[model samples]
Target: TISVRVTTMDAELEFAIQPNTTGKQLFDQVVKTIGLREVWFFGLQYQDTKGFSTWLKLNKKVTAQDVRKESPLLFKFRAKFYPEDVSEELIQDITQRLFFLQVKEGILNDDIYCPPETAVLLASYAVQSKYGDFNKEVHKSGYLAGDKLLPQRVLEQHKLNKDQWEERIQVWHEEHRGMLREDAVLEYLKIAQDLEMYGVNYFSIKNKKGSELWLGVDALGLNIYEQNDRLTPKIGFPWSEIRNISFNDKKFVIKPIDKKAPDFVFYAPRLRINKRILALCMGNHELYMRRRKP
Candidate 1:
């Protein structure tokens, strides 16, 4: 049995995997358990013996894959999608409940693929459309069966039996019949962003200069972002252009290979300094960095 917990969603999921079960089966169970289809940014993860966190892919053989576990593993399910190209993720809009799920997953994790401010934009709408504005009483007490903060899809998805499903449906018919758009979007967004890491990047840092930049390193390059302007360049530098990255107590610095291009320096008060910088770049630095051409 594998135990999965999503504390923010108040979700505790479990599964029993047979030797022949495919990873896709597990994924489907998750979708069925949650009835959420906007799953682009969310996935299951486990900690390896080496103590490093690893992504569990849905297409692999559950029994044969190296990424699969031998013992009972606790997997955390959340939004883990980070963009290789921001243009691709930013092209779409999410108005449905599942869209809210994906956005919430992204919000739950640090890897939101949309514009920084837009996390709240999608979240508020979803929450209000389903449950009206924040109700402390309903939030604390909740409905008879379904979660007030969660959508009806969840209520329907994780039902005990036919009667329970109908019970929820009857309640929805009586109390929460339909959905709302527009302002509902903003409410859920605020609700979402108020939680941890909404649209914030891993190792996100704010400098004294005013801009709060988000940075992550991937197979292609270092993803750099400035959250101030709507239309502006977010640079992803090939490893070849970067000599190296180094840091100290309060600053993380990027050294360039070219003499003309100056090194980039960033300051965040509570930074882990060099600890995260090298770890974030380790993937790209190993696979993509090439020796300078003489």
Candidate 2:
């Protein structure tokens, strides 16, 4: 039996199963353990050899793919499909909890980039969620340590010392004195959804001119970014305008709805990388279409 450790929304669960266990079997066992109802929106993710996160193939054997050689194979149960409207579309507490944890980690991991002010506010809400009603005595200057609240990039960019940043975050934390932990977390998600990088999977691709750029894929559409700045999208193409997407070797192309408009072409580093990127684009496009019409 292969030992597998799954990091869920609330806990880390370990399972001992056969090496031939299909991804579906492991997925079912995980949902069974958590008593999850809305399982369709979530998926199990594991880092590839190149450190990119990939969804576990349900039909494939869990151990057949390349994964970390840790004592127990590590995996994360994450929200794969983010709804257009997070507040109303997600009804169950479990679903909300899953999104909250995923989004929070996304922000900290810099997958979702928040501005400095926004990061501070989000951190305060995170603090509120973890420790309800911050007290002057109980929550002091160093209370925010150990547990990282802001992204490493954001923390480094700021000139403020640790205690100074804590003070600023605490001011916001104090304002939510009576707010419930659930409410605080929901508020955090609402604010988080507005960020430019929220729910976006970024790929490093280059255009025809050979200028290195970032290609951002999300629920709504595709966005282009410069090398230095990620918070602002240099160009955007909504899914409604994207007629089709195709790839040939390292070259990827995007056709727009307008016949006269030129096709947008870019090159990925490898054919294998382009395959994963194309898959994500197709999935996002389908979800975008289905969610709006239905």
Candidate 3:
């Protein structure tokens, strides 16, 4: 059993499961139990390792035949790979190479046949192929962030449509404010590099908060974030102060100070006793004090 909390509301959610449950099974169970009401499950098909093996709904009825048809490769791979010691890089390399051969042999189309795993692998390989080495130039400090700019040149080489490609870039900028920190870029690069060895071409977008958003095309169409009300959606920074807070994990906590409470606590948790608050310092101290609970 594992517990997680939302910072704004200070709400705690728990996952209760058998001790022997694999991480992949645990993830599927969590989503099945919770539903897609408020919590969004981010990064499901980011890699081959975690989350659902296929696009089947957990709580919904699915026949054995349907399972076989929907995920033949995944099922076969799972049987071979479960309890096996293998690096992600190696799996990606194999997947990419297989995908490339299929494409070259006319088994997969360039337009309708692109898979998520293929995208991840291709992107990584593109970077390495163009730049010689994967970890040569690490971008440290500047208005531009991340190591190795994913050149428009590399994307063009894939023969993907320019408008469609630019649209994807627009989506990336929208989510990350067009400025990702240094470490984030490198981490994504590693994923890309592994995927590229396999001829996959996936991209990862890292937010300022250090949370990663993986992008890919599956039957679910970007099966990254599942929409749920209980889970905290990354809407943006709070516009006002929050109070009476408690945290589930020790990594993050926010509380209010009685002496300097802000104008408004956007999403405060329930509390038996009055707790101190932190002010946002928006230059409306008096107005904020009037708004705070006594």
Candidate 4:
């Protein structure tokens, strides 16, 4: 089954004085506190309607804890390797093989050309968007020859030639970028209200710095799915431990229960020594680095 697990960690200098504090304040403070030496940020974001349904069926009775435990394996192998070691040809081969495997397993629809390497690219993009300044720093660097895959010229050409398809992509970018800012506070408030109406446990963390991290998890209920005529449930760590619950939003909230905490935390070491260098790692799959002056 194909699944995604995201984990993150933030560590600041022990001697550093406390900066801004509040939900928004803490968010930005955490970013600046880590300093900018040589950050190594990694994350994975995936969306597969068919695979999700299949996954749901295979583990219909499992709990979130169980799902968390099993999902980490999807990222484990990729996270163990360095980005430089992964070549374009290797990515293509892996993706093709996975695509065929999924087809043979009946886990994915025949109409979809879902390749494993595409997943790698998507995962890398997620990491870049969250930790590295891909949109701002790399976009401005004008360095697209060797390492970078998506360049401005390529994006522009795609945008022009595939106006209809690119329009949806543009809208998605706008929505997410809009949500990343403070104005989305009202939208989050609405989520809290919905959770309250449904009698679900909802909490928000107001960090020592001025930002707030929101959380929502189902402790008693289970989300299930069916695949190949069999029932399957998502697995995670034990729900009673409190530490086992994962965050619904990885873009802004960093949680300890994640499996890739080391990847995000590793960025602190890089940021501390070189504030001007931008480094982004994709769960150990691909690492894209570019020097920037802020």
C-alpha TM-score for every candidate? 0.39, 0.85, 0.18, 0.18
Model 4 lDDT at residue 284: 19
Count of backbone clashes, every candidate in sequence? 11, 0, 34, 41
Off by over 4 Å in 2: 48-52, 68-71, 135-142, 152-160, 257-262
Instruction: Identify the leading candidate in terms of lDDT.
Output: 2
**Candidate lDDT values, in order:** 0.52, 0.85, 0.30, 0.26
TM-score of predicted model 4?
A: 0.18
Give lDDT: candidate 3, residue 39: 22
Q: lDDT tens digits, residues 1-294, model 1?
A: 343333214367767766666667777777667766655555666665556565565777555545435445566665554333333232333323333455565544534434333432343344456556444455443342442333334434463454554344334333432445534543455455433333333456665575777665554566666665322337667777788787787787889897888777777555443464665475346533332231
lDDT, candidate 4, at 57: 16
Minimal lDDT window, size 10, model 3 = 76-85
Expressed as tens digits, the lDDT of each residue in 197-264 for candidate 4 is 12121223233353433222222321221222112233222222222222222222223445655311
Winner by TM-score between candidate 3 and candidate 1: 1
Give per-residue CA lDDT, model 2, range 1-294, as digits (tens). 999999987888999989889889999999888878878678898886778677888899988877766668889998777777788777777778789988998889987778888988889998898899988788876887777878989879988877887788888889899999988888999999998778877888998889999998888889999988778889999999988899999999999998999999999988877887787788888888877786
Candidate 2, overall lDDT? 0.85
Order the numbered candidates by lDDT, best leading.
Answer: 2, 1, 3, 4
Candidate 2: give the clashing pairs. none
For model 2, what is the error of residue 97's alpha carbon versus the real structure, in angstroms, after optimal superposition? Answer: 2.6
